[PDB]
Amino acid sequence: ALFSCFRCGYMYEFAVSNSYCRKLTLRNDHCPRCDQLTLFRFMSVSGMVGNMPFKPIGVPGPSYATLWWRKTREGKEASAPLDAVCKSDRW
Amino acid sequence: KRIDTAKRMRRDRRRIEELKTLEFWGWYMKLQRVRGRWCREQGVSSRGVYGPAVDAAELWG
Amino acid sequence: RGDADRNFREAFHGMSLDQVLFRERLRQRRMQKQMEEKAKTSLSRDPQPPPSD
Amino acid sequence: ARNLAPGFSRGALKHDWRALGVYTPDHPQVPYHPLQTWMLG
Amino acid sequence: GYTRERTNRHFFVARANAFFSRLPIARVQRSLAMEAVREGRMRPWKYTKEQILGAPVTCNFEYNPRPVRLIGTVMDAHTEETSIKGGLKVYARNEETNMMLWIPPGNPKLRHEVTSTKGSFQHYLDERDKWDEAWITGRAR
Amino acid sequence: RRRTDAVAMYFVEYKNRDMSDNHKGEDYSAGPERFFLPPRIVETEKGIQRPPHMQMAFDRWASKFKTEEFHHWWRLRHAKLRYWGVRNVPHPSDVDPLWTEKEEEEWHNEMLANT
Amino acid sequence: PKRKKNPMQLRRKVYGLHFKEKYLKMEEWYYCPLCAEPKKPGEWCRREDCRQIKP
Amino acid sequence: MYARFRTRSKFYFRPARPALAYNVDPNVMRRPKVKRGLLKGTYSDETVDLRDRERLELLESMRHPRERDFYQDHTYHNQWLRRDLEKHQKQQLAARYKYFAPDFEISPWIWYPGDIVEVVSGEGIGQRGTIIAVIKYKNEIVVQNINVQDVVIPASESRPEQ
Amino acid sequence: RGRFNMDEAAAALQLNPAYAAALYRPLNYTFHIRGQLYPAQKGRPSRPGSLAASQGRMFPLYQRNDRLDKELFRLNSRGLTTE
Amino acid sequence: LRKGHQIVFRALEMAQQGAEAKGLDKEHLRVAHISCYPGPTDKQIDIRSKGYYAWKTKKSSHLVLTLAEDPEMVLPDRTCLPYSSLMSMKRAGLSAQPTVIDVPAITADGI
Amino acid sequence: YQRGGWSPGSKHQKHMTLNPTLYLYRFPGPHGPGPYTMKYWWTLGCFPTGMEVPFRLHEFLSTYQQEHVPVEVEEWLRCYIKDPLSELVNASNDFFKAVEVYPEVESARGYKTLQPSIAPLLVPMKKFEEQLGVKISPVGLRSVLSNPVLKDRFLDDLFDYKSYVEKGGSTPHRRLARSRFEGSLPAETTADDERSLILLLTTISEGCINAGNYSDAASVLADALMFCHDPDSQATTHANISFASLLNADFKGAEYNGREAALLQPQVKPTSTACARGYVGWAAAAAYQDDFEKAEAIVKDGLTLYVGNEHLEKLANKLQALREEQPSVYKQVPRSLRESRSHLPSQQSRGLLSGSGKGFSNEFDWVEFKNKLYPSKMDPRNNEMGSVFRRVGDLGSFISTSRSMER
Amino acid sequence: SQFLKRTFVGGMGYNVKRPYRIEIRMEHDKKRRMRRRNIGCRRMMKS
RNA sequence: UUAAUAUUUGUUUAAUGAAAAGUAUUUUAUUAUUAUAUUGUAUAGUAUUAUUAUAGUGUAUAGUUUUUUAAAAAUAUAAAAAUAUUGUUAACAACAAAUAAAAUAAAGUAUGAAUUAAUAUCAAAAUUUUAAUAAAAAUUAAAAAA
Ligand SMILES: [Mg+2]
Ligand SMILES: [Mg+2]
Ligand SMILES: [Mg+2]
Numbered sequence A: 001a002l003f004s005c006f007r008c009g010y011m012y013e014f015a016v017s018n019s020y021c022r023k024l025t026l027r028n029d030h031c032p033r034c035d036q037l038t039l040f041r042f043m044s045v046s047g048m049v050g051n052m053p054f055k056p057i058g059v060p061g062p063s064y065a066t067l068w069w070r071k072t073r074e075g076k077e078a079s080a081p082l083d084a085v086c087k088s089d090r091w
Numbered sequence B: 001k002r003i004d005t006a007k008r009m010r011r012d013r014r015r016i017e018e019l020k021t022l023e024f025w026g027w028y029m030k031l032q033r034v035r036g037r038w039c040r041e042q043g044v045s046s047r048g049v050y051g052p053a054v055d056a057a058e059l060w061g
Numbered sequence C: 001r002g003d004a005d006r007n008f009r010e011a012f013h014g015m016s017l018d019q020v021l022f023r024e025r026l027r028q029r030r031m032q033k034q035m036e037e038k039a040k041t042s043l044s045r046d047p048q049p050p051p052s053d
Numbered sequence D: 001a002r003n004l005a006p007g008f009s010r011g012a013l014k015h016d017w018r019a020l021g022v023y024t025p026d027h028p029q030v031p032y033h034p035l036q037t038w039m040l041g
Numbered sequence E: 001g002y003t004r005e006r007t008n009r010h011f012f013v014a015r016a017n018a019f020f021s022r023l024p025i026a027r028v029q030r031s032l033a034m035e036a037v038r039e040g041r042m043r044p045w046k047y048t049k050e051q052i053l054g055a056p057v058t059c060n061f062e063y064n065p066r067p068v069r070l071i072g073t074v075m076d077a078h079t080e081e082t083s084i085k086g087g088l089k090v091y092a093r094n095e096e097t098n099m100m101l102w103i104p105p106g107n108p109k110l111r112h113e114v115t116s117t118k119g120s121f122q123h124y125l126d127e128r129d130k131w132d133e134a135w136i137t138g139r140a141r
Numbered sequence F: 001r002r003r004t005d006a007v008a009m010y011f012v013e014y015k016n017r018d019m020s021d022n023h024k025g026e027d028y029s030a031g032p033e034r035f036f037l038p039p040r041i042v043e044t045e046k047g048i049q050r051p052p053h054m055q056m057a058f059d060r061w062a063s064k065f066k067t068e069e070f071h072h073w074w075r076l077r078h079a080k081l082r083y084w085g086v087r088n089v090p091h092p093s094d095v096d097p098l099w100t101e102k103e104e105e106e107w108h109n110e111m112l113a114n115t
Numbered sequence G: 001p002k003r004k005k006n007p008m009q010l011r012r013k014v015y016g017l018h019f020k021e022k023y024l025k026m027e028e029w030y031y032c033p034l035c036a037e038p039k040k041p042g043e044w045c046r047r048e049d050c051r052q053i054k055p
Numbered sequence H: 001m002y003a004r005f006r007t008r009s010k011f012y013f014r015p016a017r018p019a020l021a022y023n024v025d026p027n028v029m030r031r032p033k034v035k036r037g038l039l040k041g042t043y044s045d046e047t048v049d050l051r052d053r054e055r056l057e058l059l060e061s062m063r064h065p066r067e068r069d070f071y072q073d074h075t076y077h078n079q080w081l082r083r084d085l086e087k088h089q090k091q092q093l094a095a096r097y098k099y100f101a102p103d104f105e106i107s108p109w110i111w112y113p114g115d116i117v118e119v120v121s122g123e124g125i126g127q128r129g130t131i132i133a134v135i136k137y138k139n140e141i142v143v144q145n146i147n148v149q150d151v152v153i154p155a156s157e158s159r160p161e162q
Numbered sequence I: 001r002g003r004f005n006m007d008e009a010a011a012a013l014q015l016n017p018a019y020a021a022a023l024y025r026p027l028n029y030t031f032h033i034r035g036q037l038y039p040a041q042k043g044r045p046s047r048p049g050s051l052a053a054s055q056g057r058m059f060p061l062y063q064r065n066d067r068l069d070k071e072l073f074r075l076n077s078r079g080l081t082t083e
Numbered sequence J: 001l002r003k004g005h006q007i008v009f010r011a012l013e014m015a016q017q018g019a020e021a022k023g024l025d026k027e028h029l030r031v032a033h034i035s036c037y038p039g040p041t042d043k044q045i046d047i048r049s050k051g052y053y054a055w056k057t058k059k060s061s062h063l064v065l066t067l068a069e070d071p072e073m074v075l076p077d078r079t080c081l082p083y084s085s086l087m088s089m090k091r092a093g094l095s096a097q098p099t100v101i102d103v104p105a106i107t108a109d110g111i
Numbered sequence K: 001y002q003r004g005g006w007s008p009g010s011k012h013q014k015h016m017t018l019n020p021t022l023y024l025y026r027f028p029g030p031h032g033p034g035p036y037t038m039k040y041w042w043t044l045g046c047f048p049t050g051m052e053v054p055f056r057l058h059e060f061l062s063t064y065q066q067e068h069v070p071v072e073v074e075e076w077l078r079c080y081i082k083d084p085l086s087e088l089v090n091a092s093n094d095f096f097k098a099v100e101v102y103p104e105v106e107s108a109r110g111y112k113t114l115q116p117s118i119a120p121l122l123v124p125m126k127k128f129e130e131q132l133g134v135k136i137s138p139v140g141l142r143s144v145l146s147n148p149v150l151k152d153r154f155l156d157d158l159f160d161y162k163s164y165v166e167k168g169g170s171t172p173h174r175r176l177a178r179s180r181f182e183g184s185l186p187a188e189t190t191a192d193d194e195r196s197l198i199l200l201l202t203t204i205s206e207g208c209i210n211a212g213n214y215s216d217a218a219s220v221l222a223d224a225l226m227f228c229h230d231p232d233s234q235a236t237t238h239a240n241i242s243f244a245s246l247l248n249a250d251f252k253g254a255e256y257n258g259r260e261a262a263l264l265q266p267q268v269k270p271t272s273t274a275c276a277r278g279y280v281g282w283a284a285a286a287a288y289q290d291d292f293e294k295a296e297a298i299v300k301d302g303l304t305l306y307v308g309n310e311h312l313e314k315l316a317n318k319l320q321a322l323r324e325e326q327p328s329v330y331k332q333v334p335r336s337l338r339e340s341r342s343h344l345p346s347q348q349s350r351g352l353l354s355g356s357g358k359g360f361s362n363e364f365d366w367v368e369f370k371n372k373l374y375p376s377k378m379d380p381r382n383n384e385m386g387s388v389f390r391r392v393g394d395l396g397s398f399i400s401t402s403r404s405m406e407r
Numbered sequence L: 001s002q003f004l005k006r007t008f009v010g011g012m013g014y015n016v017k018r019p020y021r022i023e024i025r026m027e028h029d030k031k032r033r034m035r036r037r038n039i040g041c042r043r044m045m046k047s
Numbered sequence M: 001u002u003a004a005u006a007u008u009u010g011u012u013u014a015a016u017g018a019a020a021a022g023u024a025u026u027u028u029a030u031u032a033u034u035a036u037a038u039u040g041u042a043u044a045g046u047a048u049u050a051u052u053a054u055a056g057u058g059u060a061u062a063g064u065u066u067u068u069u070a071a072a073a074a075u076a077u078a079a080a081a082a083u084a085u086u087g088u089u090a091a092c093a094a095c096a097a098a099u100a101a102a103a104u105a106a107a108g109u110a111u112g113a114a115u116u117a118a119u120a121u122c123a124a125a126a127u128u129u130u131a132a133u134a135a136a137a138a139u140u141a142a143a144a145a146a
């Protein structure tokens, strides 16, 4: 799942299992931008933690918002300024 | 009167819940700090049955 | 406590606490005998007296 | 082999088979010592 | 009443699974594979999926009155090393015919050879999409 | 066996008890006096020490049950299970609290003895 | 269309083996060499002796 | 191996005992008077009745945890509507408290403490005595050294049973 | 060691510790609101061999607060009177 | 695992206590007569659908239990242990046979 | 509709449109109030329907009216208690007559004859016990009466006690009275009546041991120990209690009484062997608790004190036979395995009587908590899965655990 | 009970409506706790 | 008798005020503020502790804490391939064949009804016949127990 900070809009992704279904709507997580404990809301949906029976790992998969959120922070136009310092594929 | 009382009760409950969550998060962070101190003092490392050479290789993460 | 009792046993030469205390109080009773030598509810109750005249 | 008693069929002490010519050309067998009375009852 | 479906005879109820360590089953399988290799019905192979799938395969099948010669990319493999149950999944497309073949190893009439020597995962993806589109199209509507 | 459904009971545990940091020297032949008290310890391992983070977590969870609201929850559970038809449940007037001052004092004395 | 069953029709269930194995049968037991209590082989006690060396 | 079990015919057919007409047993004046069960063979050294107050915990232990019993603290019907007792309980009351009937006291009263009187019937017949006490409303007399019975006094905390 | 206390939080937030504690229990226990009660927790008279059972004795914290009920839910007439 | 067996166990404990109070020998006791006959019963309503109802029968019974002394009784051996238990105790270090020590008889000579 | 009787106590199908009845949850049947309704009668106070009127006049009459005594009468009730000395004399005479009239058992050939029951002896012995403060075992009494020599010993000791009490009085009563008087405002030797009493109680305990009731034997020896004030008698009684506790698997009490008899050595007569028997009992208790080195040290000290009394020598030989094999198997007895193996049949019988069975009398049927029975769920010492204590929650106070899914 | 389960001693059938009425009753108990009503047993007399 | 029966089986809580209704022994239920007599505050109904959120305000992250069980058939739901059938649409519906994997519903420990009940410790089968199924008769035959 993808969560955003209520105060600043900082976004981070983390899959939610069956043991944390109660914390899927609202998460009380430490915000790196606010530098304190802030409330995080559910923004977009990821596939799942486990595997759907007799279905591949891709099913169901994240929504278009999660795929767009990743592509803006890590992709062709996103990693190009970062491929000149380390080229993460290598050290 | 009903409206005002209900809103005040819900607001106060929300504020008490926020305080409880903040205190519990602080206590859990202190707990993890003490746990890290004790692990470093006793030599315990939760990086598996192996040694630091595996983590230095960092082929498995 | 295990190694504590082990060190206790080693200090008292394998003699356990009960043996040590028994020997000490037996020596005490023997010294008491020496001092003596040198010096020389369940049952039923009866009826109480009448409360008044 | 906690339950396996050597020389006894399926761990039954009243079915002693040791010192008897039970031909087992590729399996070990133990000698016979007379069992005690308390082991059988 | 007048019949019986089960048998409780010792000969049939007894199983010999406990004594299978006296029989080298895997060694016998490898011996059969090596016999096939030395007879020439199959050639020894060792690869992973990521490096095998997507490679063109030239398959000549001895059929009367003329052997059929096809070229088709690897879509899947069933065994990493050589084995009598090796298996190979090949998608071959002719001028107007698209087919999905599963060629078993060790058949003297079905001589298939892998030639790419490499994987070509992108070519595998392209052939997968082509086969999917053709399969969905071929249904009558 | 469990009397309710006559199901077979199984004690499952870990093997290397002595090689562990926690549970070093714990005796499971009989449970503790209370479910929130630390488990039994053999006389040989009385001087053992536990990890401080786990000790603090257990102390917090145990102090949770030292309040009067827990005594009220206990009596209310008595009332609920008595209304639900469960037998051998005494009356909330006859019940007594699991945690009192003198009992807590002697349990603290025993905990300091076990260090 | 069922009718009342006589006492002899009721006792026919006792002649079967399914009735005897459920009701009329005893237990093979011995004294636990550690607890001195009656005990059936295969099941043990909640005790640090009877869990390591389970008799 | 298997224990011998036999179905009992009493569990298949056991009617009620023959009742008494006019509460008369037809052989009271013909048969001897022996305690019940002695001549039949019914004997017991100790009788434990699980309906007593002291056997409640044993009964509830022998019962199973699955079987539940409801209305333990309340009751469906209101228990504050006054209603009559059972017939046998009303008969017990009438048989015990007979002086509650109107004009039960004998008139005129002639028995006062200090009179010498003889017992004319019942146990201790023909014995003389002096009236000690007079229970006038019950029509009863306490005569001296007549009908002397043991008065059991229960044991208290600091006094034994006398 | 500084665990959360209802009284301490109420003293910090100025929220009437009684009312703060009532915020975390059913309303029928502290106010005159329609709520069902178990017949076992209600008091019963004394029997030979046992003392009397009182609901106020066996649940002192689960008592309705008339002061809080009137100051939160019931309406005052001093603000309504218009002579 | 039977409720009737539990009830008979309670009755056996009570009868054994009574026999020991009477003076009989515990190791020579034997169940001479065990029998049950019906006792008092209670009713309970069984409300059924479609406006029907029945009355369940809470049955109870009485139990007679006689313990008699039989000096000619020879009890079977119940101390025989399985080979698995024997060798497990051997592995642990315990003796396979229980340790028996001769105890001198009670003497009233010092009084 | 109406396939049976019309009363609510009937057993068949009824209907509301034809036979409407009021809601009767549970009521007694046609024969009598069953236990399922007497449970309510004792807990709730009335039958669970509420239509029955509670009529407890009979139990009121049995308890309250009986236990009611006016204060003016109870003030004088205590002033007419029977004389204790005369009561003891009469009880002793009756008990002696009832023991003397006991018939001699006839010894049959080929089978064991049943001993005559002690029917007329339970009441006189009850009066004797309640007058002397010491309980006598009926099994032990029966065994003493069966044994011809023990019966003669018991008769002689009881006659001596009778004569001494009738000629001089009750020395235990004198001691208690003098102690109470001294407390309101020393210790003499064991008198002849006390000697006869402890002698007959030792005979009863020996008969009880011959029967096989070690608990009752040890109890009789314990309540006989309270009548000896002489060092020799005390050492003998302590040795006897140690042996009885060894037989009853009371290792702690056996060791205590053995070391007490050993400590009574300096002030005892040199001819007595009670101290040797106490050392024997102490070493045997140690060996049963599996302290082999402790038992060897104790028996060595006992030998050095008494140079080789036969009992000490046999016990030392047995300990040496065990020591010639213990290092051949394990070099010692493990510490976590001591006092773990059962050795005696007394503890086997005790476990048979008070063990945990399959289904009941275990930690899954009912649990005890301060003289009250609880279900397996409401167990304050356990929070295993299925207990009510896993549903407590945070109680609206603070987050006690870091668990996210439960609690 | 192994021989009994093998030889089918007992009703080979079972109740079918319970695995759904159980969760229905659990949801109803949730609703009762919401409405501040005491929880009652699902089957007081049908047992 | 059915009945060794059907049925029950308490291991995890997402929501907030009346009145009708219910009177269950609130021992001083509350402890106080204001002012000013008097009066009254806890629990429905469907024969029940029952498929059940009574919708009168009002709004909301208090997780506002009773559902056993170690395989099977039939049945009940849900899913159900790169086989085939008919439509919508740019995945949805049923179907017939592999109708196949896989999910939920056990004895046994407990409690325990109801329909039903002329009846021998009931009689497998075949044939012939007799006043309507004939279990009524007769002749052949040979039919175990759970
Ligand atoms: Mg009502
Ligand atoms: Mg209602
Ligand atoms: Mg209805």
Ligand SMILES: [Zn+2]
Pocket: A005, A006, A007, A008, A009, A010, A031, A032, A033, A034, A038
């Ligand atoms: Zn932020």
Ligand SMILES: [Zn+2]
Pocket: G032, G034, G035, G036, G044, G045, G047, G050
């Ligand atoms: Zn054991």
